[PDB]
Nucleic acid binder design. Structure first.
Ligand SMILES: Nc1ccn([C@H]2CC[C@@H](COP(=O)(O)OP(=O)(O)OP(=O)(O)O)O2)c(=O)n1
Ligand SMILES: [Mg+2]
Ligand SMILES: [Mg+2]
Ligand code: NA
Length: 337
DNA sequence: AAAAA
DNA sequence: TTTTTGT
DNA sequence: AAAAA
């Protein structure tokens, strides 16, 4: 029996149902834009379950017993079985609102609210937005337009590794006992990503040392001329754009703009932070949903709390978090829900 | 949109 | 039916 | 702020 929870499924990058999931991902994205949160999440859960299947759906009998596939979703699957295409997803791909939202939000610093604003103003192209004399752009959007081609090309493994070296070299300069772990997609075995994410922790650093590290590391990069964009969120994390010199990559202008995210956590909470930052987003949502609805527990990136026992559960590894929740251990490369 | 309360 | 959906 | 991350 397949579980409705991603945290009770093993999802690798070997997708046998991309015909169905690409259509479901488009329908979900449209519902996000139309502020239909419920319908959006239902199409995301249906897409996630199909990604876990060890075989391709070739008939409607194949969908029997699979959870998260209600009547609406089964109609979409039936249509794709019929002629290899989704008429519903095709209509979304040709919709002017959907096309504008995809194009506008492809800019770093532009989300659903700004994309909706520009569409209602009558904008349809990035050229018309950038050249407009009345529009005022945030610092994030200015960086998003300036480094657009580099950021839209995404990041490969040689680039991510080159970035890992830069992060580790900078971090150990200020905290020599610090542990730096690449998280996100790359930890789950992905070949590419929209960014490179890292978790930093130190077993001997003080409360003040822990607080100052991200400021020290980003100032160091600013001094080198490598910091293209920086936003530090106090507890603690930062959203960056780094200048990655081609010579650093072991695989034009001679460099590439790379989106990098850094997270600093207290040593004793490192397992919770690693689990939260490894992802996928769907795996994390279902872990938290399972904890709440199935175990009466509260899970977040910092802790696990048992509401019945009225106690915080400690963990030195991800394996211990899974054991507390009563879940079989899912490896990082199996969390691609 | 699907599943549970 | 209403509520929940990653507080 | 709100928005974006
Ligand atoms: N809405 C989100 C977004 C992110 N995360 C967590 C898990 C993934 C980790 C990385 O965030 P992203 O870098 O956006 O996700 P990604 O899994 O690494 O995908 P990509 O490789 O394209 O960056 O943060 C999350 O829990 N919920
Ligand atoms: Mg990432
Ligand atoms: Mg990210
Ligand atoms: Na964006």
């Amino acid at each position: 029996k397949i579980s409705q929870y991603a945290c009770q499924r093993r999802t690798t990058l070997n997708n046998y149902n991309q015909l169905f999931t690409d259509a479901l991902d488009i329908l979900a994205e449209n519902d996000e834009l139309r502020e239909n949160e419920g319908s959006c999440l239902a199409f995301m859960r249906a897409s996630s379950v199909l990604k876990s299947l060890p075989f391709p759906i070739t008939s409607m009998k194949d969908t029997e017993g699979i959870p998260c596939l209600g009547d609406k979703v089964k109609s979409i699957i039936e249509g794709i079985i019929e002629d290899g295409e989704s008429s519903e997803a095709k209509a979304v791909l040709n919709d002017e609102r959907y096309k504008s939202f995809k194009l506008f939000t492809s800019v770093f610093g532009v989300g659903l609210k700004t994309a909706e604003k520009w569409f209602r103003m009558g904008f349809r192209t990035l050229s018309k937005i950038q050249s407009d004399k009345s529009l005022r752009f945030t610092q994030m959007q200015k960086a998003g337009f300036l480094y657009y081609e580099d950021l839209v090309s995404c990041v490969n493994r040689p680039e991510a590794e080159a970035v890992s070296m830069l992060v580790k070299e900078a971090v150990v300069t200020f905290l020599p006992d610090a542990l730096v772990t690449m998280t996100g997609g790359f930890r789950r075995g992905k070949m590419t990503g929209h960014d490179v994410d890292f978790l930093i922790t130190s077993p001997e650093a003080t409360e003040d040392e822990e607080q100052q590290l991200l400021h020290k590391v980003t100032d160091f990069w600013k001094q080198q001329g490598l910091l293209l964009y920086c936003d530090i969120l106090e507890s603690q994390k930062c959203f960056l754009i780094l200048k990655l010199d081609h010579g650093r990559v072991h695989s034009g202008k001679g460099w590439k703009a790379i989106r990098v995210d850094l997270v600093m956590c207290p040593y004793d909470r490192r397992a919770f932070a690693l689990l939260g930052w490894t992802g996928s987003r769907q795996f994390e949502r279902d872990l938290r949903r399972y904890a709440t609805h199935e175990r009466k527990m509260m899970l977040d990136n910092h802790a696990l709390y048992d509401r019945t026992k009225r106690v915080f559960l400690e963990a030195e590894s991800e394996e211990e978090i899974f054991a507390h929740l009563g879940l079989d251990y899912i490896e990082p490369w199996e969390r691609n829900a």
